[PDB]
Design a protein around this ligand. Sequence first.
Ligand SMILES: *[C@@H]1O[C@H](CO)[C@@H](O[C@@H]2O[C@H](CO)[C@@H](O[C@@H]3O[C@H](CO[C@H]4O[C@H](CO)[C@@H](O)[C@H](O)[C@@H]4O)[C@@H](O)[C@H](O[C@H]4O[C@H](CO)[C@@H](O)[C@H](O)[C@@H]4O)[C@@H]3O)[C@H](O)[C@H]2NC(C)=O)[C@H](O)[C@H]1NC(C)=O
Ligand SMILES: *[C@@H]1O[C@H](CO)[C@@H](O[C@@H]2O[C@H](CO)[C@@H](O[C@@H]3O[C@H](CO[C@H]4O[C@H](CO)[C@@H](O)[C@H](O)[C@@H]4O)[C@@H](O)[C@H](O[C@H]4O[C@H](CO)[C@@H](O)[C@H](O)[C@@H]4O)[C@@H]3O)[C@H](O)[C@H]2NC(C)=O)[C@H](O)[C@H]1NC(C)=O
Ligand SMILES: *[C@@H]1O[C@H](CO)[C@@H](O[C@@H]2O[C@H](CO)[C@@H](O[C@@H]3O[C@H](CO)[C@@H](O)[C@H](O)[C@@H]3O)[C@H](O)[C@H]2NC(C)=O)[C@H](O)[C@H]1NC(C)=O
Ligand SMILES: *[C@@H]1O[C@H](CO)[C@@H](O[C@@H]2O[C@H](CO)[C@@H](O[C@@H]3O[C@H](CO)[C@@H](O)[C@H](O)[C@@H]3O)[C@H](O)[C@H]2NC(C)=O)[C@H](O)[C@H]1NC(C)=O
Ligand SMILES: *[C@@H]1O[C@H](CO)[C@@H](O[C@@H]2O[C@H](CO)[C@@H](O[C@@H]3O[C@H](CO)[C@@H](O)[C@H](O)[C@@H]3O)[C@H](O)[C@H]2NC(C)=O)[C@H](O)[C@H]1NC(C)=O
Ligand SMILES: *[C@@H]1O[C@H](CO)[C@@H](O[C@@H]2O[C@H](CO)[C@@H](O[C@@H]3O[C@H](CO)[C@@H](O)[C@H](O)[C@@H]3O)[C@H](O)[C@H]2NC(C)=O)[C@H](O)[C@H]1NC(C)=O
Ligand SMILES: *[C@@H]1O[C@H](CO)[C@@H](O)[C@H](O)[C@H]1NC(C)=O
Ligand SMILES: *[C@@H]1O[C@H](CO)[C@@H](O)[C@H](O)[C@H]1NC(C)=O
Ligand SMILES: *[C@@H]1O[C@H](CO)[C@@H](O)[C@H](O)[C@H]1NC(C)=O
Lengths: 79, 79, 79, 372, 372, 372
Amino acid sequence: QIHWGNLSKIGVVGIGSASYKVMTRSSHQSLVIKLMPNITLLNNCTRVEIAEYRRLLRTVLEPIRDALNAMTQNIRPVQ
Amino acid sequence: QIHWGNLSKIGVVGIGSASYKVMTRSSHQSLVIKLMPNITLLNNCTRVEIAEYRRLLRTVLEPIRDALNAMTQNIRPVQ
Amino acid sequence: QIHWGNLSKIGVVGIGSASYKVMTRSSHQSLVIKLMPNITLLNNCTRVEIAEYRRLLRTVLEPIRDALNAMTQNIRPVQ
Amino acid sequence: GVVLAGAALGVATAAQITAGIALHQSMLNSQAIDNLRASLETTNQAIEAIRQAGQGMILAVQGVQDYINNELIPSMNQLSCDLIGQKLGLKLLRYYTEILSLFGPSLRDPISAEISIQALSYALGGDINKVLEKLGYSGGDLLGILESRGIKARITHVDTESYFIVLSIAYPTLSEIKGVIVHRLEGVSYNIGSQEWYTTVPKYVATQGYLISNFDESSCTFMPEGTVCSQNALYPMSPLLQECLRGSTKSCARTLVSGSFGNRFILSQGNLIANCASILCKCYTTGTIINQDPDKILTYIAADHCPVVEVNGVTIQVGSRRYPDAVYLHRIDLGPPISLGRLDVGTNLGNAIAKLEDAKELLESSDQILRS
Amino acid sequence: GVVLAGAALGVATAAQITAGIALHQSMLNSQAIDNLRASLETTNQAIEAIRQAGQGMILAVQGVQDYINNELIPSMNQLSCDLIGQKLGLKLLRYYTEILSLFGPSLRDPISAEISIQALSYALGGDINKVLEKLGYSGGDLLGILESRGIKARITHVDTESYFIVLSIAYPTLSEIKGVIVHRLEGVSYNIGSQEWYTTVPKYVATQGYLISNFDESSCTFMPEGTVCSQNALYPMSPLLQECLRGSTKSCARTLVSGSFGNRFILSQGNLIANCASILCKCYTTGTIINQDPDKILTYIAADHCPVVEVNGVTIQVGSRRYPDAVYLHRIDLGPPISLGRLDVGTNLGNAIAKLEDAKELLESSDQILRS
Amino acid sequence: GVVLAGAALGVATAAQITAGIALHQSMLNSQAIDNLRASLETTNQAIEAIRQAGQGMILAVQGVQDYINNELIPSMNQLSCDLIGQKLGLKLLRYYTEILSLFGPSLRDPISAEISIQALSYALGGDINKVLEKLGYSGGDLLGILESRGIKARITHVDTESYFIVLSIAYPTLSEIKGVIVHRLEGVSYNIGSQEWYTTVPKYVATQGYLISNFDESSCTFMPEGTVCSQNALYPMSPLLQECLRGSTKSCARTLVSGSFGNRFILSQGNLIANCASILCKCYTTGTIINQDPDKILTYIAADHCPVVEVNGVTIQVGSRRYPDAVYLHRIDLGPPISLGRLDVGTNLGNAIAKLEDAKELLESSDQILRS
Ligand SMILES: *[C@@H]1O[C@H](CO)[C@@H](O[C@@H]2O[C@H](CO)[C@@H](O[C@@H]3O[C@H](CO[C@H]4O[C@H](CO)[C@@H](O)[C@H](O)[C@@H]4O)[C@@H](O)[C@H](O[C@H]4O[C@H](CO)[C@@H](O)[C@H](O)[C@@H]4O)[C@@H]3O)[C@H](O)[C@H]2NC(C)=O)[C@H](O)[C@H]1NC(C)=O
Ligand SMILES: *[C@@H]1O[C@H](CO)[C@@H](O[C@@H]2O[C@H](CO)[C@@H](O[C@@H]3O[C@H](CO[C@H]4O[C@H](CO)[C@@H](O)[C@H](O)[C@@H]4O)[C@@H](O)[C@H](O[C@H]4O[C@H](CO)[C@@H](O)[C@H](O)[C@@H]4O)[C@@H]3O)[C@H](O)[C@H]2NC(C)=O)[C@H](O)[C@H]1NC(C)=O
Ligand SMILES: *[C@@H]1O[C@H](CO)[C@@H](O[C@@H]2O[C@H](CO)[C@@H](O[C@@H]3O[C@H](CO)[C@@H](O)[C@H](O)[C@@H]3O)[C@H](O)[C@H]2NC(C)=O)[C@H](O)[C@H]1NC(C)=O
Ligand SMILES: *[C@@H]1O[C@H](CO)[C@@H](O[C@@H]2O[C@H](CO)[C@@H](O[C@@H]3O[C@H](CO)[C@@H](O)[C@H](O)[C@@H]3O)[C@H](O)[C@H]2NC(C)=O)[C@H](O)[C@H]1NC(C)=O
Ligand SMILES: *[C@@H]1O[C@H](CO)[C@@H](O[C@@H]2O[C@H](CO)[C@@H](O[C@@H]3O[C@H](CO)[C@@H](O)[C@H](O)[C@@H]3O)[C@H](O)[C@H]2NC(C)=O)[C@H](O)[C@H]1NC(C)=O
Ligand SMILES: *[C@@H]1O[C@H](CO)[C@@H](O[C@@H]2O[C@H](CO)[C@@H](O[C@@H]3O[C@H](CO)[C@@H](O)[C@H](O)[C@@H]3O)[C@H](O)[C@H]2NC(C)=O)[C@H](O)[C@H]1NC(C)=O
Ligand SMILES: *[C@@H]1O[C@H](CO)[C@@H](O)[C@H](O)[C@H]1NC(C)=O
Ligand SMILES: *[C@@H]1O[C@H](CO)[C@@H](O)[C@H](O)[C@H]1NC(C)=O
Ligand SMILES: *[C@@H]1O[C@H](CO)[C@@H](O)[C@H](O)[C@H]1NC(C)=O
């Protein structure tokens, strides 16, 4: 119920209209991030770098796994 | 006419002044983004990758070209 | 003294409390950004590029050095 | 069917509860995780699909495998063992920095967090085009969905022993809300004497029948086939602002404009609406200057009195009359002048509340004075 | 002991004075600069410690040395001299761009500026993990300190002749402020008839005894051990908002919510607080629909009346009662309705100030009216 | 000379009109496009200048040609054909992502859009220094212009047949506005009893003779020779705030100060203005603590009473008196206390408007009261 006649008297006009569309998600897919590379053909030239890489990953992975396990333990079968 | 005397009684002081400069454009130059690389010395090793790249570029280039042509068709000689 | 009883009557609840921790600095370390790379094993292959790189660096380093020297000249021994 | 143990949980928001329960349906069971672990330890590609029995495929992405396969392995006989380790360590630490950026303490409530596919770009190897292709996400709505951050992922499993993260990703479908129209509003300044004013209205408004609502364009992409939003863009508009858009000109606030203002004319319905007191309007057909009467605030130019008009050094040919000739200022009720600066609002609100606090006793006795 | 010459300096803020005076204990003297310059020339590694005899260690970082050592030098025989120069020139120009971005005119007041270690990441070679390792910065607090940008660098010396910048970097230590609790506030909508309302409260508030203040979370990281902030997060709350949080419901503002709202129920202390007039609430134990009386605005669900409750398609088992049964609307004093949009605020404030201006003579003569 | 057909166009913004007319002047004609197309099919360099008869020079930029020339072609004889394709495909997909980011649906109106040269960095090959050099953009104003994002580009032609985009780019010239001075305002706190207060003023203000206006610094770079702005930085200041800056101290809003505050003293004209009730001020020359009288809100320290003064653990030598001795609180009119938080503003405005509409009948009937 926009009054375009009054609005144009103070310098307001419409310059375009469009429909409104929202998003709903029905199906889901699985995407896994493989954090450990295959280094078989590097003939153990990257032992020290990989070991430090795994050490750094645990400081991030462990808190998320704890948060995930905290909610999962409160979910029980309906019966 | 800032009153620095009364402003200092409530703890406001000026700590520096400068002139004001704005930008005006006199001439323009042309800059073309060449989206297709020269792959002549690469032989035929990149035929599949280039074809996918050109296909993806069209989904962006065509809407811009249509918007440009919409304006240009409304521009007529003053004659 | 948050009144949780009255806040819940209009739909406001507390969902977690935590302690507050701030930061203070006791000691400082030195970190020098070495802007000139060692190019000895590259022979004379990078003379032109290094000269242009040094020329560009001057336009940034000189204003900062002037600002640093302006403040230091006003610091005097207590005696 | 599962039940949430609220007493053990204690406190949880609606988003946490909904995301926690959905974790029972979107999470691979213990057998599928064990099967996934064995399959991951046999692949050497950056992007690869894992097929497991009668289940939807799991897309495995390794973030540094392209560099290992394309850069390090071919140079294995040429570079020393020490140099190979130094180059991979540089990429591993840079990959960790992006993992820490995305999944570290900056991530608030990982259970309920929804991460866009663009935020995952570095974790997926620096690009998402092949990931989208291998997931089957395509069509005519892909650009609109992708630009509004419609493709989102949820964390469903973190495996510390084998170092992988399982995400749940969905390609959304678009549904048009029936009867909702999003309007784009543009303004032209006007002059009251020597002062140039500008009506304050929202950039976008939404209507549904006779309802008028605000519209947030932050999560929306305006496509030629309709605006596409990944969140809810409609939020309520105050009654005073709704009065303005329904015709009450005295309910619309106005503000002063700077010296150099870009909106002093507009083309609307083939007619030119111009603040001819602040720009030079000239009729090109007859060569005469169009003067704005000081008792008018705007000029509406149509082909009846000026077929071709020069407005700002730009020559425009206008169509037939669609806006009536300008009315006098005394037939327009103008709204209150405001300043939209943050510190101008607080300065003026503080002055206003100080006056209300000084006259508190008189305002309390609103019935002891009227009934006297 | 040093003295600032204020008369010669003329004008300076407290931050410039404090940072300027600090640039006498943290700045290497003229002999240490000469030693550093000669020592820098002999190194060829990306990250190097200097060990200037009985002095604190200096960490030297060269931004493109890894590329030269790992990519260019090994391929010196294979590649032509012209190609080697072109490849290094690309990295040098990109490195210069980041130096200009960090230390150029966009840096306001270089002496007083504090630069985070993350902002220096590209200048340090694209990663900071190895720099942090060789500075000795480690521990359980590192993750929280790093994420809230607690590690700060300060410009100390710029050497134009040898092209290096000396920075002063410090690893902060954490300190609990005793008695300060940071509260996270969450809300649920409620219905007055058919309209759905929502109380406007801050996301975080801080208490110290009987004091209530606002909390700014912009520079804070919420760790399991506590909230870690790199700036001061406490700033005062207005008395009206403090009255709201102290029990006065009439002092709390409220807003209208949109059609799709995700805060229509919450789990608190084992009980479920649900709107139940804007969502469907059903008791799963008995199968009956929980109806919300129009004279009530909220529903508080406990095990005494419904051990297991289905809300919004989610089945939740609730504990014993810890919230009383909802009181009637006539027993609750509701606060003023507001709209939090910027343009809604300005439109309404302009209307309010116009009314105050149109009644200036009435309000400035309150003493005369009250006396008579 | 061209004319816009406004009847066919229907609706157009002033910015869209101006940009559309400028297309006729900045767009290469059909013959030049065909000549440019053939020239682009003979070059193999990342950056190349095209000479086209007696016309302007066109600079051609290819975004992945440095990688092909420096990385792929030299290793053509030592890598498999599939490997060469895989490596280039990684760069092509990443280049497409940046093209879509820049020229995709997120670009609202391509015709009137102005893209900065820094936003084009990846499309130009990852760096703009060589592009600027080959365009001839150099001088003493380059750093200020570049930092303000003053170098802009406009889309003028998109060629889908040969896959190239023509942009019109301009190097601006700086012009000083006569008589405009930009002032930087700095404040210190003061104590009224035990409460610490802070005057709320803009960070920057601009004056032109007797005119005072606000100053927006978002598009401005503060260079030693002046302030360089790429947009209009001047916008009006509300009359109440102009009253503050013109001497009316009662028109200046004030706010409470948190526990830790860094603006408790300042050096101005060689004198030290300090809140000595909130920090410790000691006269170093005499060893006497400087006490602030509770009937005074600030302390004005000059050499006539304390040649060398210690504040906040900093020793400062001050000059001759430039500020009078502090005046009593009862001779200063203070402004209204405000809170600048977004939610504090809405809460207090809602309370104020509720009071005004509870006295709607009283305020409207003010002439029947003043007459009686
Ligand atoms: C498009 O634009 C036009 C012009 O802006 C709008 O017309 C205005 O409409 C409003 C709302 O009706 C009018 O305001 C009302 O005017 C009535 C008549 O006022 C006479 O007396 C005053 C003297 O002070 C003259 O200035 C005026 O010209 C008239 O001669 C009053 O009766 C109203 O006051 C009372 O209204 C109702 C009573 O039922 C109650 O709310 C209160 O008692 C209130 O006091 C009110 O002031 C306004 O005058 C019109 N302006 C004009 C004609 O210039 C159109 O409404 C708008 N279109 C739409 C669809 O909204
Ligand atoms: C938790 O929440 C509850 C309910 O929200 C709060 O209870 C409210 O407390 C306030 C402050 O004590 C009460 O406000 C005062 O109530 C008095 C009640 O008297 C009658 O008022 C009308 C008259 O018919 C009836 O509707 C009402 O039921 C009472 O019979 C009023 O007299 C007061 O009026 C004030 O007016 C002006 C102030 O502008 C003064 O000049 C007057 O002297 C007087 O102070 C005032 O309104 C409020 O009524 C209570 N709400 C109820 C009972 O529903 C709790 O205080 C709160 N707990 C905490 C710890 O904060
Ligand atoms: C790292 O990558 C290597 C390859 O470079 C992986 O080894 C490969 O694993 C695959 C997957 O099982 C093997 O394919 C299988 O081969 C048998 C025939 O022997 C067939 O029955 C199966 O259907 C399947 O195709 C492949 O042979 C094997 N290749 C080699 C050279 O070993 C290896 O597992 C990875 N190692 C890790 C991640 O530690
Ligand atoms: C660039 O890098 C080279 C190395 O690639 C640097 O040369 C190195 O210089 C240092 C100090 O001058 C030498 O180390 C010293 O060696 C002597 C014994 O010769 C010893 O007494 C010292 O304790 C110290 O270890 C190092 O041997 C030398 N290396 C080589 C290969 O020459 C060079 O200085 C760097 N910078 C330039 C050229 O600007
Ligand atoms: C890709 O790049 C190659 C070069 O690597 C381009 O071939 C080059 O084409 C130009 C123009 O045709 C040749 O220059 C011309 O040379 C003649 C003398 O023969 C002279 O009359 C002209 O004024 C001009 O300088 C250039 O020699 C030629 N180079 C080679 C090695 O063939 C090729 O056109 C590009 N192909 C694409 C983009 O498809
Ligand atoms: C600089 O500051 C001083 C003091 O803050 C300003 O003096 C103030 O001037 C205003 C208006 O001239 C005075 O208000 C008037 O006061 C009288 C006396 O009651 C009354 O009849 C009027 O209705 C009105 O309220 C104000 O009292 C006065 N301040 C004090 C403390 O007496 C001075 O004007 C400022 N200078 C400039 C150039 O603005
Ligand atoms: C790593 O692999 C190599 C392959 O060359 C082989 O010696 C062995 O499996 C490992 N070597 C060491 C030293 O760990
Ligand atoms: C390129 O051509 C060769 C034969 O010349 C053949 O492998 C195929 O047609 C192409 N190969 C690739 C990898 O594209
Ligand atoms: C480097 O030295 C060689 C040998 O004299 C010379 O040919 C070349 O031009 C020099 N300069 C370079 C590569 O910049």
